[PDB]
Each structure stands twice: as C-alpha cells, then as structure tokens.
Coordinates of C-alpha atoms in Angstrom, one line a residue:
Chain A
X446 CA 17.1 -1.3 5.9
X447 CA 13.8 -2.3 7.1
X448 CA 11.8 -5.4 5.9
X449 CA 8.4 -4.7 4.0
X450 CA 8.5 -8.3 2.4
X451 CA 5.9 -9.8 5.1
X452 CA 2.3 -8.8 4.6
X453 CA -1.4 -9.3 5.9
X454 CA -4.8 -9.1 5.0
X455 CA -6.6 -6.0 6.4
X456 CA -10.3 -5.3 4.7
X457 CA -12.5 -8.4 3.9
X458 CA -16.3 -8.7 2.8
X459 CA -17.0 -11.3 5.5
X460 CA -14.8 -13.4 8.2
X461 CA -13.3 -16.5 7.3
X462 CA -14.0 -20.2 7.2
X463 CA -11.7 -22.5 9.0
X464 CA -8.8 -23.7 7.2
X465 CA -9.6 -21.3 4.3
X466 CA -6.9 -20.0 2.3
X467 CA -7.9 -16.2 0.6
X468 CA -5.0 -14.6 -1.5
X469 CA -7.3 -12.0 -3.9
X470 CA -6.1 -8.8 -4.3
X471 CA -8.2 -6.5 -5.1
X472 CA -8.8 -2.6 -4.6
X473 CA -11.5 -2.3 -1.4
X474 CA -14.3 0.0 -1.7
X475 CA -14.9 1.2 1.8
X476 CA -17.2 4.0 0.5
X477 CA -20.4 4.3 -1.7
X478 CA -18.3 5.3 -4.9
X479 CA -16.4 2.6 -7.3
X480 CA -12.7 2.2 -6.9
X481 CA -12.3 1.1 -10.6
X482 CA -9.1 -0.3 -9.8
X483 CA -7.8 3.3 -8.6
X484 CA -6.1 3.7 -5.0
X485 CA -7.6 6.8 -3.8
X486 CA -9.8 8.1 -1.3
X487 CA -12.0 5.5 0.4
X488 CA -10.1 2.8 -1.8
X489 CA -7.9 1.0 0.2
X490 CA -5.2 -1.7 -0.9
X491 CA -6.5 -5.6 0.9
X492 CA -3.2 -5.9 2.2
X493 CA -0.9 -4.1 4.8
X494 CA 2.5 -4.1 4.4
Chain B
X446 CA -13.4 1.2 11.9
X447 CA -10.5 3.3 11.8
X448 CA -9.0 6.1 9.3
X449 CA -6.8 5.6 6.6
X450 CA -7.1 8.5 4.1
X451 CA -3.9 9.9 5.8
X452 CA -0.7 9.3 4.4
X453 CA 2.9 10.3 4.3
X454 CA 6.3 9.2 2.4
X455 CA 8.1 6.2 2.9
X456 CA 11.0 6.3 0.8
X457 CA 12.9 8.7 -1.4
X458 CA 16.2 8.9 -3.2
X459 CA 17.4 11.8 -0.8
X460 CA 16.2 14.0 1.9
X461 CA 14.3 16.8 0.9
X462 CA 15.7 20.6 0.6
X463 CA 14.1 22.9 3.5
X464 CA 10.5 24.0 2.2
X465 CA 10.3 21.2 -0.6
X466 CA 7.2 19.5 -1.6
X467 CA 7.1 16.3 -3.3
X468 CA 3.9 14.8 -4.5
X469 CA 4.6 12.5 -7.2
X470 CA 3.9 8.4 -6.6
X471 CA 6.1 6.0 -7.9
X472 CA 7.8 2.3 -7.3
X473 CA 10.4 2.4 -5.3
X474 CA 13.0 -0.2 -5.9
X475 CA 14.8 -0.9 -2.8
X476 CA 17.1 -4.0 -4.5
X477 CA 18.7 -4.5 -7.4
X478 CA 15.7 -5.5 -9.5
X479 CA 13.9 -3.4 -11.8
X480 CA 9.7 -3.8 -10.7
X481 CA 8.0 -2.2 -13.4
X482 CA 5.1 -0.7 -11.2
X483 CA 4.7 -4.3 -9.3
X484 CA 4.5 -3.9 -4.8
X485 CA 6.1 -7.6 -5.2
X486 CA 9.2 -8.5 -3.9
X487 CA 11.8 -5.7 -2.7
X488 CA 9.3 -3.1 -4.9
X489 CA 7.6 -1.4 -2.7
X490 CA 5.1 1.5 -2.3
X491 CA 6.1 4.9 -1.7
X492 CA 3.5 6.0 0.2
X493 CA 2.0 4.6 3.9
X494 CA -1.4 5.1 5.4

C-alpha cells in the first residue's frame, strides 16, 4: 500500500551544525506574507513525506 | 529553488465518477486508527506537492 511513515526535512533557515539534531515543525514562509500557521500558497510544510 | 504551489490527490475512498471534482482536504486514515487531524503515524495528508 505504499509507505509514507519515513520523512525528511526539506526548508531550513540556515544549514546545520555537525552532529545537530533539529526536529521543529513549523509552517515555512517561503514568501513575504505570514503563514500564521496556514498551509497555503508560499507556506510550505518543513517536512517531505 | 524549485516550485511547489502545485498539487494533486493522494488518496481517496474511491475513484472518481467521469467529470468529478473534488476539492475538499481532509486526514486520511490509511490504518485502523482514528487521527483526529494529526499527519503522525498511518494519518496522512491528502494532498502532494
């Protein structure tokens, strides 16, 4: 039936540290308008399925 | 950077009758679990960018 159990992080402020562990998830603004915690247009979910 | 306002279905209860439109966004349970509006485990998100 298909596995979507198994995700990753796609949209980031800034790269990584080494060995640093990020698991916020939290509505990304791509755009210059505020998500306010609504996945729309420009307002991308972190992770990818 | 890549686009990612365009989206499409993922999963339904049935296939669609010729010339149907469906537009409404919901969780999708695919196990025996009620989610509650939660992309956790086996509750997944209808739609795909």
């Amino acid at each position: 039936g298909g596995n979507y159990n198994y995700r990753y992080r796609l949209f980031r402020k800034s790269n990584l540290k080494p060995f640093e562990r990020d698991i916020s998830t939290e509505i990304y603004q791509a755009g210059s308008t505020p998500c306010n915690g609504v996945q729309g247009f420009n307002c991308y979910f972190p992770l990818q399925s």
